Amino acid sequence: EKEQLFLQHIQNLPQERLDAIRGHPELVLKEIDEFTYPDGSGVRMCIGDVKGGFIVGKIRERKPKIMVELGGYLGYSAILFGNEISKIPGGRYYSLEVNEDYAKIAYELVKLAGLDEIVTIMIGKACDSLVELQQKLLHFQALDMVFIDHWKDLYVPDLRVIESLNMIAPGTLLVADNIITPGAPEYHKYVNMSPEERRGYQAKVRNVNGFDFIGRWDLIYKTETKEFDAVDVTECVGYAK
Numbered sequence: 001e002k003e004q005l006f007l008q009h010i011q012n013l014p015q016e017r018l019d020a021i022r023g024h025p026e027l028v029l030k031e032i033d034e035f036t037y038p039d040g041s042g043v044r045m046c047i048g049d050v051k052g053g054f055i056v057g058k059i060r061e062r063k064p065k066i067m068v069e070l071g072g073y074l075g076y077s078a079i080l081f082g083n084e085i086s087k088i089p090g091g092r093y094y095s096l097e098v099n100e101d102y103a104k105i106a107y108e109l110v111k112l113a114g115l116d117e118i119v120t121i122m123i124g125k126a127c128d129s130l131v132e133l134q135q136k137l138l139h140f141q142a143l144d145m146v147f148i149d150h151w152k153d154l155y156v157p158d159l160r161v162i163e164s165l166n167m168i169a170p171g172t173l174l175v176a177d178n179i180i181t182p183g184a185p186e187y188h189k190y191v192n193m194s195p196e197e198r199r200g201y202q203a204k205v206r207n208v209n210g211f212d213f214i215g216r217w218d219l220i221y222k223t224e225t226k227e228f229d230a231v232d233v234t235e236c237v238g239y240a241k
Contacts, residue, residue: 003074006043007105009035010112023114025083032076032109045073045149051228052080055147055175058233059084062173064144065091068133070126070158071150072097075106075113081147082110082119093119096129098150126154127161127209134165142169148187149177155187157208160215168219174234179225188232191223195240 010031021027032043047055059067059081067085069077072095085091093115097103103123110119122129146162148155155176162168179188193201199217207213218240224233 002037003102003105005037006032006035006074007108010109018112022112025079025113025115028109028113029076029079032074032079043074043076046076047080048228051177051231054226054228054231055081056084058173058175059145060087062145063088064173066137066140066143067091067093067145067147068130068143069093069095069147069149070154071095071148072106072121073102075109077147077149078106078110078119078121079113079115082115083113086115086118091118094129094133095119095121096126096133096150097121097123098125125209126150126158127213130158130161130165130167134167141166142172143167144171145173145175147175147177152178152182152184152187154209155184156190156205157213159187159190160202160207161209161213163216163219164213166216168216168236170236170238172236174221174232174236176232176234178230179232180227180230183230188225191221191232191234195220 021031033046035043065088067081072078078093078095082093085093095106097106100123103121107121110116122133176187178184190198195217202215202217219236220238220240222235222237226233
């Protein structure tokens with residue numbers, strides 16, 4: 001709706017502006033950042049300068065070959081992080097977006113930014129796309145980096161899907177947005193739980209995504225909260241006894 005207005009804006013840009021920004025990720029991000037709706041508001045879910053720079057720093061430091069985003073909206077994150085992923089040989093970025101309308105817009109922006117061969121947008125429920133992605137990757141076991149910024153109540157349910165799919169291993173980094181506002185106490189709690197506390201959590205809390213996505217309790221997590229507005233930075237550092 002409101003999102004279609006932004007797409008229309010991009011599509012009705014002068015040929016000279018499209019030519020100037022095509023294939024240039026930072027320039028495309030700037031067009032998204034500078035757009036204003038009739039009511040004066042901006043495009044939602046643009047990643048801020050400092051936080052973006054923080055997550056980019058992590059990508060540059062750890063050089064994930066496979067980065068997955070739970071969420072995606074209109075392509076901002078996929079363009080910012082996918083651009084860094086494009087610097088890494090073999091790098092792929094997967095954006096798992098449930099709203100099909102949004103994903104169609106993010107696709108156009110990702111394409112305009114020149115990131116189409118690197119960035120795949122998977123449409124549908126995150127847990128379904130994770131199952132599909134794992135199976136596709138099998139035909140290497142774990143994800144290198146996961147960016148989590150969709151609906152707060154699916155943070156733990158989807159993480160448990162990833163764990164159950166064995167896509168978390170030592171070296172895997174989880175970066176979860178909006179921990180404080182509004183934000184996501186349950187996820188913050190889960191990744192700070194010991195392996196035994198999570199053993200019991202999993203037996204007690206049914207996963208809404210499906211019963212057999214129980215999770216994996218024997219993963220050792222080390223979590224740090226960065227404030228700017230806060231993100232949880234969780235590294236899998238080992239397996240429990």
